[PDB]
Amino acid sequence: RIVEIPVCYGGEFGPDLEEVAKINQLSPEEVIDIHTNGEYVVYMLGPGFPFLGGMSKRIAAPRKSSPRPSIPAGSVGIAGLQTGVYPISTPGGWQLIGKTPLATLLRAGDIVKFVRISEKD
């Protein structure tokens, strides 16, 4: 069950696309189409939050030292070498790189392919 997730990247949507890119001697524009190049098997452990297996090591990133009091719902983050989408507005220090509408849609074993979209969408 492929699920094409449309996400705006960086700017207000992705507060940490510069850090993610920075850390890995890369550009925000390079980070986007690396992430979008991916093919992600959805998994979970222990939530109902859709962890996404398959991310490129070239865009790995450490979790923000101090947690945010609230990541917005629909955010799209990277923690370590794990990517994934936020169904509801939780707190956490995942490096936020983008945002979709509007997810439970993703269930264990699904396949996620992110596609960019304009701010105007």
Side-chain angles (χ1 to χ4, degrees), residues 2-3 5-11 13-17 20-21 23-24 26-28 31-36 38-55 59-62 64-65 67-80 82-89 91-101 103 105-106 108-114 117 121:
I2 290 137
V3 166
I5 287 172
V7 355
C8 215
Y9 283 93
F13 308 101
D16 318 330
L17 211 221
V20 165
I23 286 191
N24 307 260
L26 269 165
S27 44
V31 176
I32 298 172
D33 64 298
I34 295 297
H35 196 243
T36 317
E39 202 160 309
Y40 305 100
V41 177
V42 168
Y43 72 101
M44 287 129 180
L45 36 260
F49 169 91
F51 290 92
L52 277 173
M55 170 166 140
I59 302 309
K64 283 186 153 272
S65 40
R68 285 197 184 78
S70 159
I71 304 146
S75 275
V76 161
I78 302 167
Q82 273 184 358
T83 197
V85 188
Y86 270 92
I88 101 177
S89 144
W94 274 40
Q95 299 287 155
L96 304 171
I97 82 199
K99 217 210 201 118
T100 45
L105 213 225
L106 309 175
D110 275 47
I111 282 176
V112 175
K113 263 277 202 175
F114 296 112
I117 50 163
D121 322 43

